[PDB]
Amino acid sequence: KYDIKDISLAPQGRQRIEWAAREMPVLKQIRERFAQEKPFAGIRLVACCHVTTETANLAIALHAGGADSLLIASNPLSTQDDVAACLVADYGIPVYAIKGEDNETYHRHVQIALDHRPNIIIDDGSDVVATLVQERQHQLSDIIGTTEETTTGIVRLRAMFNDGVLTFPAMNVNDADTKHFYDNRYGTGQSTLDGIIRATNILLAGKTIVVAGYGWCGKGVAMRAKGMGADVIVTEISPVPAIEAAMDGFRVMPMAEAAHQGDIFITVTGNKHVIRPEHFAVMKDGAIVCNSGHFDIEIDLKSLKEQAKEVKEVRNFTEQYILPNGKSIIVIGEGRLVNLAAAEGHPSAVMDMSFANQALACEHLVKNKGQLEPGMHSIPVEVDQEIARLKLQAMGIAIDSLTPEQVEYINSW
Amino acid sequence: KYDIKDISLAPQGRQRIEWAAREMPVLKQIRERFAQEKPFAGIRLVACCHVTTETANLAIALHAGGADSLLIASNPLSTQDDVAACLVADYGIPVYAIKGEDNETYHRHVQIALDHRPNIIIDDGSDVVATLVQERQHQLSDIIGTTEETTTGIVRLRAMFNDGVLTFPAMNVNDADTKHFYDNRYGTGQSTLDGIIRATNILLAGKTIVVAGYGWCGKGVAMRAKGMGADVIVTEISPVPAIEAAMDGFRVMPMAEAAHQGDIFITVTGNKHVIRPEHFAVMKDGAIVCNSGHFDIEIDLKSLKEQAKEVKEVRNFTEQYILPNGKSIIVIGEGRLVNLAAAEGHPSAVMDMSFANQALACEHLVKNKGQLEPGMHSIPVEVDQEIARLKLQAMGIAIDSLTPEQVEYINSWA
Amino acid sequence: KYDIKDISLAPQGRQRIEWAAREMPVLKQIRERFAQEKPFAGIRLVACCHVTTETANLAIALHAGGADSLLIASNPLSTQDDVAACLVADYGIPVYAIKGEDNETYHRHVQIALDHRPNIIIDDGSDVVATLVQERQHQLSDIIGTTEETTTGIVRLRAMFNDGVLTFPAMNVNDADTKHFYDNRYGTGQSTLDGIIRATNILLAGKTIVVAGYGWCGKGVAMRAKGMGADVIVTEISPVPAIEAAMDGFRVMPMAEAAHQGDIFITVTGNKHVIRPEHFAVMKDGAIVCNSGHFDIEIDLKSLKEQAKEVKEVRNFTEQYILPNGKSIIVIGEGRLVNLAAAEGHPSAVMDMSFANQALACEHLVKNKGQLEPGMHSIPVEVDQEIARLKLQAMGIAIDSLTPEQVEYINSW
Amino acid sequence: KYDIKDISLAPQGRQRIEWAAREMPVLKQIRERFAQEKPFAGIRLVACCHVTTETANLAIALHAGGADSLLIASNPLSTQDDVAACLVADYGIPVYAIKGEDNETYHRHVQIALDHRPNIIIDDGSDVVATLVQERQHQLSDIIGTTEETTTGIVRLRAMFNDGVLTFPAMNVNDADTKHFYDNRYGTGQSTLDGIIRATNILLAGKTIVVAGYGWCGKGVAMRAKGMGADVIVTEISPVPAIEAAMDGFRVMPMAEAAHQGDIFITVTGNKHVIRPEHFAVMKDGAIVCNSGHFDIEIDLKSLKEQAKEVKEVRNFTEQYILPNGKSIIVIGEGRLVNLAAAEGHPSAVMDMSFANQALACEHLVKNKGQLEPGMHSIPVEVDQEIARLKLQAMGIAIDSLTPEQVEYINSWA
């Protein structure tokens, strides 16, 4: 039926869900259009997403479109139990997600999710799609297509394609302009610092903050860190973004040099073990480390636990590791996505554009069922452009249009 | 002997208090010296402050110095019930403060605090000091001196002085360099937006944020709103801060003109009725108003309650007022100091210096008992500068010092 | 032989050219490599570029590579006569460019340039390449390939391809990451405000500055304008960049609304008549207008001249137009690229990366002569990436490299 | 009767002077009132200022008020020869100032200015006032009062006062709100980088820029360096501005530590030998040093000239010193105020307020002749605030005013 924490939390989820609806006008139009055209009639669907108020508004949209939906958590700490309760209670959408569930339960929910025999799979981090490929080859005849929300999921699908196992259409939702130009940049920018502050109420001004990676997320995090008064260090593996950060006024250096200097560390690389044992040993006493990439494995907390003589919870979402010399390493959110673990995730304004993309990419998969080459597909430019047009309109912002003479001038050489 | 929500919240309170101390090293050195020298022996003290982790650390330092302290809330919505529980349970420090208490309860706590017969009064907004002078003229022999934490309190103290009723010393803690340069600016800047985001999780980037007042607080709020991607409008009544705001890149305009453009309004003026019905009437459907000045009277909420046909709670610390024509005004924290009502207030890093000023100001009053002129006193320059030196050192920052030749150059004029 | 203003200015050009060489280390290596491999042996070449100290350093690089080079001006006001003098005098490179030459002389230099019968044509704005196609079809057998420096030139080549007349390889230098991520953004950002300040010494802080277009140049100009204390308005025709500007803290609105509010206007669209007659009539008395797109036609100065009763020079590079009601419109640089007309153009740091691209794209054309499809070609990723690596090294900035385990993790799904 | 480079440059000078006036409307209203009331009738006046378009506009306004003025250069490298030509040719105003004059010529102009027997002295750095007090004690009966434009002059005036030799009124123009809040911060911020860029056309983005001193000037320079994409390091000697710089997001450290990291160094401290040989020795090959404090002595260039084996001019206003080990130090403007040596100085928009203070301060001295105590005087609050009001209005910016009810709230304390 469902697997949640407490069903009596539904009136709180419903409240917070509709509050978030106010800045999801684009997804409001698509759900309004879906309820009249029912694109997902007779379609079974799985979403593996962060159980937030925004994700609820997407599920409501696919529900209105006729989909038979089952939501599971993309992360044990991102789940909001009040919205998981409202979804089961007010819409009948089975949800298998409990805040702080153990890893046995996460995979038990994945097994429950695939037994839905989904036609569409919305994924975020590519966990269900990888499990489907590895354990349920017999279920591939059910797949019309899948979607992927986050950069880390797109990298794994690239390895699925190059391994020869991406034998179905996968909509690359994360790489749409209206997705990661905003979500990854502006959303992660604000909400990462939100999580750090809700966890610690630490003053960012006057601290050295080390941002690992200067991609979409890294640019946003460094920008908001600087905006909040911090001295920002950036690390990288690629020369083009490293030059960007330097010309943006940020200090670029190897992580081994930055480990001696940082007060707060924020990983947003998508890569494994970006903060390492040899980095913990030179960190300032009381240095704070956290992660805003999709998986917690950007920080080597395994090694940290073995290097430490004592660990202790000292505030919400905050652990103090004490080393044998008495120095302390602070870890927020157990290394999980700090914006989702220690706060509420992205404001709905950006998830409007993310889940507008998610909604239409699902519509795209069904509308072209049987006509898609296997492998990755981009969001059509017109869809991506129309989302931006609707969002701009909804922000109350008007811009210019070219005149017939301006159009003719572009075409002369 | 106290009046708190629930004393079983003490262990959470203790955990949060210990965390806050990690960025209060100046106050830790002061507390450690007070424990040895006992400057407050035989002194009864009343503190009217926001009952936060940072105030607890101040209370502890006063308690180490031998103070017989009693603590009450400076605002009904800023109280942290776990902090109040911990100070009572772990330290035996009487606390009369309940988060969300009505005004009758607040006024009763002031009377109870005055019944402590304080010798020193630490105030935040000057409620207790005003009530003492207004009602307890027979008690004024107790008073060694008082202190005042915030700008609005300093304004009330000036009006008391000009009335000829400030017949005892009052330490202007707010105006110390190491107080309002950092607390009022960098503290309010971060924690105001913190409160707004904890209340609504709204995206600040792309919103138009109207900041009423461009003093120490207004500069911090606009600074941080701009850092978070917002389009900032500043309103003012004085031309010097108005020009500063323009050359800092912000749009300056009268509030009647900002009223139809703002998505979020934040008042930090210290004045009354900064946002009025004629402003509510033209605001965008769904506009957010909140206040980070000391009192909620910066926004005319009483008129808004009368105009609206409905008010609903729509999120924690968030109310939706629906006007007769159907448009919505959104209020955070019932207009009370939003950083303290919807979040936790300033980070301890800045309260370290503000409350270092409070501790050294109380020591200043006792050591100079019977030697200070009545009226408002600035924090001694030596005290203010030494707080700055200790904080910089604790921040791990090193700077230069003048050579004898450079000192020789300054005193020259030929 | 050449067509310059004054040959006795050579010692001043040589001085300023080598000063600019200090922050052109990447182009230093390529010229050093070219002098040993002589990629342009027996090759005739034309450059139509801004006659600046940086352009001189590029010409020196192609000279060292064996090229028989002839430089002409891309704009009458961008020419620095001291560097035009040093090129003819110290290297023997014929130059036909005179600061403030009339439009008869510009085209007379273009006719002189094509009579060189070039094998390679480096262009900036696509003027010589368009004239070659239109008037010298008989010379197309000489073309191994061409290059294009600026966004406006790429748009014209797109119209040349779509018209069916781009019958040769054209290297798209402008769109390399190391080109327009820096040049167009950071270079135009600083040097546009440099031109405005050298022209007027006006305080930017406290002024409303209107930036037309939020592309690479627009993002840089708005960023530096804000950094200098200005209230920034942005105009656009496309929803995605318009949302970017809003979420960057800038006010986005139609130009017709911004015309009432701006103190300084800066066009960087690449399009025609972005500031119009109906905009001049509502501008504040004393409003300043200038252009940093490639052609002056972004502002309709033709109409401004007819609407005005009087025009008057009031400072260097600065004209005052007085309207019949007495209000004034200030025009800087006659509407030409204000960074080049009123100052010196981009600092050499960015032109290092631009002309490194220019150098190698020319080497690319000859190394693959006869093996290139007709039409536009991008800078090879490896070239673009190697430039960034060399520049980062030369800035003294070190970054990280993935470990073998980090590489293996990326490849698992 | 004057001493200028070339009087044929007057028409260029006149064009630049008229342009500068377009953003000097407060001074234009003052000039227009002076033309009517002639406050300076029968007054001889000496001005020691940077001979710029903005100073010319001030000189014109003084000339309209009837002043018999004589102008000399405050610095050998800040003089604009076309301005000096115009003031002499068009206005008959004696100017003794040549751009790049040696020190003998400078000192001779001071003697010539003192021979004018001034009644009012407008000074910029206090050279003339110091020389008057040191050498012309028999002349002090002439003096109605003097003014001082800049922070270094105020420091010298304080040292004169503490010596007991400041026996006449001296108006502190620098410290007026409408002066150092905008001129020293927003003016120096823009024009310092302007000077650097006009000298070198170097890309500021990605460079490490070391700003010595975080006062009014230092805040502006760091602010604008950061706005232009630079990585900013701040050095200091006092903890209060040091903490501010950190909470503004800058790296604070001793100069010995910044010396090996900076690409560009800018001194705005008012102190002597802020950059020393032990700093030159560890600087990056090719590092830029320059100064925007009043005197060039902030950088120990005399030691650098001794250490270096060669010095070459490599660009306008740009010298390359080559040390014995072959590494280069680059100096802009010979260490003189780089905004004024390599560019044009502050935009007129801010000098409008600074020089409005100069004009109203000279009027203040004359109207109060024989009524002021000797020593340093602040600009009257009424004058300072009225300059701010007029500038805001001229900037087209409108703000709010207090209702009677809000005034009633401020005076209340109950």
Ligand SMILES: NC(=O)c1ccc[n+]([C@@H]2O[C@H](COP(=O)([O-])OP(=O)(O)OC[C@H]3O[C@@H](n4cnc5c(N)ncnc54)[C@H](O)[C@@H]3O)[C@@H](O)[C@H]2O)c1
């Ligand atoms: N927490 C959130 O709300 C949220 C939202 C969106 C994306 N994400 C996650 O954030 C991560 C980054 O996504 P993105 O959009 O920024 O990706 P991206 O591809 O645009 O950028 C990642 C950057 O990190 C750099 N990098 C990689 N390995 C590195 C290393 N070892 N050290 C330093 N730099 C390194 C890359 O060169 C690149 O510039 C992904 O895991 C993504 O799923 C999180």
Ligand SMILES: NC(=O)c1ccc[n+]([C@@H]2O[C@H](COP(=O)([O-])OP(=O)(O)OC[C@H]3O[C@@H](n4cnc5c(N)ncnc54)[C@H](O)[C@@H]3O)[C@@H](O)[C@H]2O)c1
């Ligand atoms: N919430 C917090 O944690 C916190 C912290 C410190 C102070 N405060 C409070 O914030 C308020 C402001 O303090 P401050 O230090 O900024 O004071 P301030 O004296 O430095 O500046 C206040 C500014 O408001 C302006 N102003 C006054 N009335 C105005 C009006 N009607 N419209 C627009 N502008 C107006 C003044 O001209 C001045 O520039 C006070 O009530 C103070 O007690 C709150």
Ligand SMILES: NC(=O)c1ccc[n+]([C@@H]2O[C@H](COP(=O)([O-])OP(=O)(O)OC[C@H]3O[C@@H](n4cnc5c(N)ncnc54)[C@H](O)[C@@H]3O)[C@@H](O)[C@H]2O)c1
């Ligand atoms: N002056 C310089 O030193 C310099 C350097 C590089 C490029 N440029 C020139 O600057 C111009 C812009 O180049 P870019 O790299 O920014 O190009 P771009 O393609 O990256 O961006 C141009 C932007 O302008 C917008 N735009 C187009 N027409 C518009 C209109 N009528 N109103 C408002 N916005 C409009 C487009 O939507 C786009 O976002 C080109 O002409 C280019 O050649 C100048």
Ligand SMILES: NC(=O)c1ccc[n+]([C@@H]2O[C@H](COP(=O)([O-])OP(=O)(O)OC[C@H]3O[C@@H](n4cnc5c(N)ncnc54)[C@H](O)[C@@H]3O)[C@@H](O)[C@H]2O)c1
């Ligand atoms: N170039 C211009 O146009 C212009 C304009 C105004 C003032 N000035 C000059 O700029 C200088 C600074 O003026 P201001 O208004 O900023 O003064 P200020 O009093 O506001 O600040 C000077 C700062 O320098 C710091 N400082 C002093 N010695 C130092 C040292 N050895 N190392 C580091 N920091 C040190 C002080 O602690 C202080 O914070 C003065 O010489 C003034 O006359 C120049």
Ligand SMILES: Nc1ncnc2c1ncn2[C@@H]1O[C@H](CO)[C@@H](O)[C@H]1O
């Ligand atoms: N965390 C906090 N703890 C105690 N007082 C606070 C806190 N944050 C702000 N304040 C104080 O509250 C006053 C406003 O009433 C300000 O002057 C400020 O110093």
Ligand SMILES: Nc1ncnc2c1ncn2[C@@H]1O[C@H](CO)[C@@H](O)[C@H]1O
């Ligand atoms: N454009 C200018 N004209 C005249 N004086 C100037 C100019 N720019 C800066 N100054 C002044 O020079 C002083 C420094 O000697 C500063 O106090 C400042 O007011």
Ligand SMILES: [Cl-]
């Ligand atoms: Cl749609």
Ligand SMILES: [Cl-]
């Ligand atoms: Cl102490």
Ligand SMILES: [Cl-]
């Ligand atoms: Cl190479």
Ligand SMILES: [Cl-]
């Ligand atoms: Cl006046």
